[PDB]
Amino acid sequence: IFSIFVI
Amino acid sequence: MIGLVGKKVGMTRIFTEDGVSIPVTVIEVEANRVTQVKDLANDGYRAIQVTTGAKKANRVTKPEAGHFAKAGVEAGRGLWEFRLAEGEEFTVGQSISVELFADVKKVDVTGTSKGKGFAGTVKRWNFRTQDATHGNSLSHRVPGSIGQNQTPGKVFKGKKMAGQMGNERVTVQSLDVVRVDAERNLLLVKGAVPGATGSDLIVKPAVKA
Amino acid sequence: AVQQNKPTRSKRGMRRSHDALTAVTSLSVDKTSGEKHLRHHITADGYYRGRKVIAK
Amino acid sequence: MIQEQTMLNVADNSGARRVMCIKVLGGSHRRYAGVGDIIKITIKEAIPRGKVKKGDVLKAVVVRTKKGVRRPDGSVIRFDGNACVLLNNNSEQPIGTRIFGPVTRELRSEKFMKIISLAPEV
Amino acid sequence: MRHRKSGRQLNRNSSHRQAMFRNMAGSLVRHEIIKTTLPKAKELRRVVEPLITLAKTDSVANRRLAFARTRDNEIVAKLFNELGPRFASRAGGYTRILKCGFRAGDNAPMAYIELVDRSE
Amino acid sequence: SNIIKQLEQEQMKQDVPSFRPGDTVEVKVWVVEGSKKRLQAFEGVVIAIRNRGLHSAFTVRKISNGEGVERVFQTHSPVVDSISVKRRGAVRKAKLYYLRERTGKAARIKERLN
RNA sequence: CGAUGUCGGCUCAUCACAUCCUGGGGCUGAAGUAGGUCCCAAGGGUAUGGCUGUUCGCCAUUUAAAGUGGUACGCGAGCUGGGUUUAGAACGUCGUGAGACAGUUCGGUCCCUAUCUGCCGUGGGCGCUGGAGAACUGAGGGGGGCUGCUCCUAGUACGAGAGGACCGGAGUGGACGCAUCACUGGUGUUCGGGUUGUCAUGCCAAUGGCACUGCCCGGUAGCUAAAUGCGGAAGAGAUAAGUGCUGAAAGCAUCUAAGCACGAAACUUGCCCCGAGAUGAGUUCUCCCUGACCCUUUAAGGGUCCUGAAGGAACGUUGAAGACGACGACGUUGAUAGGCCGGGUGUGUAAGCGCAGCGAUGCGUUGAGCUAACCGGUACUAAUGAACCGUGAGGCUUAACCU
RNA sequence: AAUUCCUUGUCGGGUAAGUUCCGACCUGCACGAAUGGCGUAAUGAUGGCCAGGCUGUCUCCACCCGAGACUCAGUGAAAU
RNA sequence: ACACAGGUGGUCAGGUAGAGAAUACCAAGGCGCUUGAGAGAACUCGGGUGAAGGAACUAGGCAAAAUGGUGCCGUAACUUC
RNA sequence: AGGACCGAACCGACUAAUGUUGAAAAAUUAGCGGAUGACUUGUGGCUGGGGGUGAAAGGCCAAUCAAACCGGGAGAUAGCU
Numbered sequence A: 001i002f003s004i005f006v007i
Numbered sequence B: 001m002i003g004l005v006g007k008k009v010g011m012t013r014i015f016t017e018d019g020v021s022i023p024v025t026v027i028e029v030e031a032n033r034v035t036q037v038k039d040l041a042n043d044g045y046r047a048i049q050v051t052t053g054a055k056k057a058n059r060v061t062k063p064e065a066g067h068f069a070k071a072g073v074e075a076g077r078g079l080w081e082f083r084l085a086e087g088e089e090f091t092v093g094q095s096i097s098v099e100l101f102a103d104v105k106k107v108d109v110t111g112t113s114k115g116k117g118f119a120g121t122v123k124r125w126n127f128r129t130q131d132a133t134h135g136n137s138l139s140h141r142v143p144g145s146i147g148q149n150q151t152p153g154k155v156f157k158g159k160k161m162a163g164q165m166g167n168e169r170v171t172v173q174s175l176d177v178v179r180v181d182a183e184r185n186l187l188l189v190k191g192a193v194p195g196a197t198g199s200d201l202i203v204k205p206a207v208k209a
Numbered sequence C: 001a002v003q004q005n006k007p008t009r010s011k012r013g014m015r016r017s018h019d020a021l022t023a024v025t026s027l028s029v030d031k032t033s034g035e036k037h038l039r040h041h042i043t044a045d046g047y048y049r050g051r052k053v054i055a056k
Numbered sequence D: 001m002i003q004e005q006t007m008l009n010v011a012d013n014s015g016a017r018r019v020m021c022i023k024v025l026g027g028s029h030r031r032y033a034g035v036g037d038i039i040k041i042t043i044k045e046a047i048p049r050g051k052v053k054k055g056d057v058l059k060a061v062v063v064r065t066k067k068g069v070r071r072p073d074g075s076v077i078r079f080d081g082n083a084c085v086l087l088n089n090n091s092e093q094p095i096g097t098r099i100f101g102p103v104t105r106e107l108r109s110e111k112f113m114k115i116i117s118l119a120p121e122v
Numbered sequence E: 001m002r003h004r005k006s007g008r009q010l011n012r013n014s015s016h017r018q019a020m021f022r023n024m025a026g027s028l029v030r031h032e033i034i035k036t037t038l039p040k041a042k043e044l045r046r047v048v049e050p051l052i053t054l055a056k057t058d059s060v061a062n063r064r065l066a067f068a069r070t071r072d073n074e075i076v077a078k079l080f081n082e083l084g085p086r087f088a089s090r091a092g093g094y095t096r097i098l099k100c101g102f103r104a105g106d107n108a109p110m111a112y113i114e115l116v117d118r119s120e
Numbered sequence F: 001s002n003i004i005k006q007l008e009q010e011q012m013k014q015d016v017p018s019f020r021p022g023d024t025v026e027v028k029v030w031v032v033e034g035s036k037k038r039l040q041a042f043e044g045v046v047i048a049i050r051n052r053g054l055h056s057a058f059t060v061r062k063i064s065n066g067e068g069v070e071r072v073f074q075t076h077s078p079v080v081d082s083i084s085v086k087r088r089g090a091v092r093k094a095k096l097y098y099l100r101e102r103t104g105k106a107a108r109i110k111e112r113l114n
Numbered sequence G: 001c002g003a004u005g006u007c008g009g010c011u012c013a014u015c016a017c018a019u020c021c022u023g024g025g026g027c028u029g030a031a032g033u034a035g036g037u038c039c040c041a042a043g044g045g046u047a048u049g050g051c052u053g054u055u056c057g058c059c060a061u062u063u064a065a066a067g068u069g070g071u072a073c074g075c076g077a078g079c080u081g082g083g084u085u086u087a088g089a090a091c092g093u094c095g096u097g098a099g100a101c102a103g104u105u106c107g108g109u110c111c112c113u114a115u116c117u118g119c120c121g122u123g124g125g126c127g128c129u130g131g132a133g134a135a136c137u138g139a140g141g142g143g144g145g146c147u148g149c150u151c152c153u154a155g156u157a158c159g160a161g162a163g164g165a166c167c168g169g170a171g172u173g174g175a176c177g178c179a180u181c182a183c184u185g186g187u188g189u190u191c192g193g194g195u196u197g198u199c200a201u202g203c204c205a206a207u208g209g210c211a212c213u214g215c216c217c218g219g220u221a222g223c224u225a226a227a228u229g230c231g232g233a234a235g236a237g238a239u240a241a242g243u244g245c246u247g248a249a250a251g252c253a254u255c256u257a258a259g260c261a262c263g264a265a266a267c268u269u270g271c272c273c274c275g276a277g278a279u280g281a282g283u284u285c286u287c288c289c290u291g292a293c294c295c296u297u298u299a300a301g302g303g304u305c306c307u308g309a310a311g312g313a314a315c316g317u318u319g320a321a322g323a324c325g326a327c328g329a330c331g332u333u334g335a336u337a338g339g340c341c342g343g344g345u346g347u348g349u350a351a352g353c354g355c356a357g358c359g360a361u362g363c364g365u366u367g368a369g370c371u372a373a374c375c376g377g378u379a380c381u382a383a384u385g386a387a388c389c390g391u392g393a394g395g396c397u398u399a400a401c402c403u
Numbered sequence H: 001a002a003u004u005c006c007u008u009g010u011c012g013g014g015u016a017a018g019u020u021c022c023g024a025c026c027u028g029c030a031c032g033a034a035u036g037g038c039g040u041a042a043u044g045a046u047g048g049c050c051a052g053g054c055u056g057u058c059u060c061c062a063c064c065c066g067a068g069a070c071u072c073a074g075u076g077a078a079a080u
Numbered sequence I: 001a002c003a004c005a006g007g008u009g010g011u012c013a014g015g016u017a018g019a020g021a022a023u024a025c026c027a028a029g030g031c032g033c034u035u036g037a038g039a040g041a042a043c044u045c046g047g048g049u050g051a052a053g054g055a056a057c058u059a060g061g062c063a064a065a066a067u068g069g070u071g072c073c074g075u076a077a078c079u080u081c
Numbered sequence J: 001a002g003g004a005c006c007g008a009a010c011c012g013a014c015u016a017a018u019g020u021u022g023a024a025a026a027a028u029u030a031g032c033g034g035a036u037g038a039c040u041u042g043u044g045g046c047u048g049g050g051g052g053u054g055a056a057a058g059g060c061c062a063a064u065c066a067a068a069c070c071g072g073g074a075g076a077u078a079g080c081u
């Protein structure tokens, strides 16, 4: 693829 | 006109009456002996071919020797051509001294630059150095981007990159001639010519004003 | 960074065109003892250029 | 070698005391001023009376640089500190009227004559 | 980038190097022969041969110097009494390097270095 | 440097007296003032010396009108003309760079008197 | 959608021209200085800061100028991760509530050792038609192409004044570039010295280890920029817009249809560098090889004995050459490296002994002692006598000379 | 303003120049009194702003010492 | 998962300097870490020094640099004293 | 006297760089906080899965957590690939 990104 | 082959002994000042320091490279210029003349008949062009130093007999090969044989031998360091232009010279080891430059004010000078071997960008091309700090991750002297994206989809030719630096030809041009000294074989040109102490040098009167 | 296609058996060989070894030829004989040896090196017995240095 | 930022001391009255170089005039991207070059300046200190006051923006003449000066023959003159003479923004030309500490021969300019006429040395 | 520099590095630091060539000078002046890698051998010369030279003139000082290097009274002793006079007449080149070549454990290129008149 | 050296020593002054770091020399240098070619005297402490044949220089530190000024003369330059020692310094130290951090009463150097 | 990392910055760029500056023009409501506008021009050049995440924009101050665009709004397998920012939290706001909000605020893992293409370098192979060592020719390619200010022309032309030229000279700068260490300096853990703590060499005295080179003051060579030399050009060709000469078609006029002249940092050259794999593999000089014999399907045929050149390579000592290859110097008929002798340079008056002093310490002998990569010298050591590779006159055809 | 969209509001201060900061105004898009209001000495690896010192953070990078990178010998992976 | 720079409670504790179980150098004792040998490039990692300038860097002084002991003298707003 | 002060052991984990097919499935180095207390630690005990425990983060309950793991219903169902 984670979910980390752108978006 | 033509020019000569010398040897960088190199670099010292000479002071003047009214108190000025003239930095000069000291070029030793032993007499150049023409080993061959060339002509539009024996195709091509008008040029002379000199040698200047002295070489160990056991180091001179048969061919090199046989070539020196035509004309006054005493094999020198190497050979060099100068193109001609309505000046003329007969081969019988004509021998050309530093005499040549008594009246010359100019002189160009060409050495073989000191060998840096590598450098990479920054040294080689004065590339800027990335943040030394501020989060930079292993990219301090690296070259950074080297192309665009899909559309060139390649790196263009001649891109400035890391690689061999120096130990190549390079000449300097202009260079006031400070002193000419026959029977000493000296030539003081004002300041700084390429290549290291001891290395071979070619000086010619300057092509530019 | 990784290949997108298996390099071939051919390509492998190519890369190794230079990986091959050289013999010696410059193997030379001591003037006193018999002795083959590397040039400018002591012999098995301790001779070098005729003289006997090294007892070992 | 003076460059933007860099505090300079002042070698005249006018009353500046401490001053900061905010531009090396005279060319695009010109890095350093020294010797006897001109620089834009913002007053940082200023005595209470004085021709100038703190916060003013003027020009000034580098008169002593610690990196000093060379000229012919190969010698060097170095001064322990960096000092300048304030100039009026339009006319160059010192706004002061007395010079302090030695100044150098290089300054032998038409416009800077008033400085070397004043000034107790070189 | 090394132009005209002098002095090998042998993948150590100044300290390590200094102490090693000290131990080795000893090991040479003592045994008069040692087996060592050719690089290490060649450098050894620039340590030892000066010592022998130094010894050619006996004084209190010259001994005390020969002790600030090497740091072994037995060898400052063998010099001066033995090697000093033993070469008192020799221009230089008190040693010679003979190469056997290629240690087993690591393929290191090898060589003997002896005092030149070893004879014994 | 054998063909140099020759070129060089045939330019070197010979009258130069001997001085030493610490000495309080006065160098009298030529100066085209403006219209007049006169002599000008620089007197200060020798704080460092050259010692390279033709290229020999030295640094003299003056403390003028407030804060110091240093001059490096190339000793063998025409523009120098005269140089006399005027006081003998007791320092034991080849370069007196430390003086730069001193000021007046704190920067005095003893007579060498021997 | 079995994954095409999305804003700005940084580093590096690259094209277009609708040209910001520099260049050449027409018109001007162009007197001059200076503008405006259109045409031609893409060779080079084209700002540091304040604020903000910004791009931008405003502001300060420069500058000849601070150009507009394309390149996945160039540039995450180059960096940054401030701004979009999921797991925390709070404000305002909406909601009964869970929560929600281009409202906002504080906080918050940025992988990949490069197979391929490309690209910067650098070798190996074979070719180039006997082999070999040099020196060349230059198809072709790349590099470079910026500009200020002052003085003279001249306070002249012009202008009522104020102001203030074209054209042409001369200096001297900015930014950029190449080279080099003579000067000025940086570094200099391989030189010398000072000094703290402690351990050791039996002890005094003198020295060594360890503490970031223990801390630090100097500093040789080398490498170097802030150091100091040099460069952009002049000239020539053919042109752009433009201006002409002569000139009919069209009795005239007209730069054009014939014909002729001017004309710009663009073009082709001139300058610097690379360069015959230029398979279209070029030229020139020099060196080297002048033995026997057999077999068949008898031909650029295969082989046996002799022979082994010019040269090359290997090995060794090696270099201001170098990742490795490579390139240069040298191998005893020898200065290639180390050592050694003398000098220099650095440090700054060693140790020992004497004198003074209660002593710390001072002075004398003593500008001593020590001194790297430097300089000039020197066969003391190490570079061996050889072996290895490479051959033994070099295709056919036609032509021209001669036999 | 941890609340203000319009908004870099407006005025004052600091800077050569300040969308942040400090002080004010009040037009509070959409503070407010125990889902506490306004203050507060001291404390804080708390947020924002400033200055002296300091400096290779920067102008602009140079040299040096060590560990890799490169060469030889031995062993000998990986994703795709 | 390894002959893995990690985690693992208790006990003993010498000399010189030191307030010290900090720290530096040592004793008793224990080790040199199971690839080495050469080269002295780019780049990367970890360190040292730097002309003139001194935050111009940058989202931000991030990082570096600096400060650094003991005794005495001396020390502002404010303050819940 | 003190959830008092400076500071090792011990307990923590604010910044950075390194590391990211690691030396290590969270560490190393340099700095950093606490250090007589709501401190820290060895041994042993009790709490169980819509349940525990929680100075509260949806934290932790064996490298697993908006409902642990093991076996079973079991070939759940899959208008989807």
Ligand SMILES: CC[C@H]1OC(=O)[C@H](C)[C@@H](O[C@H]2C[C@@](C)(OC)[C@@H](O)[C@H](C)O2)[C@H](C)[C@@H](O[C@@H]2O[C@H](C)C[C@H](N(C)C)[C@H]2O)[C@](C)(O)C[C@@H](C)C(=O)[C@H](C)[C@@H](O)[C@]1(C)O
Pocket (backbone or CB within 6 Å): A001, A002, A003, A004, A005, G003, G005, G110, G111, J020
């Ligand atoms: C250290 C070791 C780990 O690396 C990191 O964590 C880096 C730093 C992540 O970036 C981190 C950090 C960051 C910024 O990604 C760059 C963040 O956006 C993502 C979500 O996580 C990467 C790359 C993530 O990929 C990215 O995931 C995105 C959904 C799409 C993106 N893609 C389109 C290109 C893709 O590459 C992702 C999923 O972890 C890759 C998958 C295969 C893995 O799980 C593998 C095992 C990784 O954990 C890892 C390599 O072992």
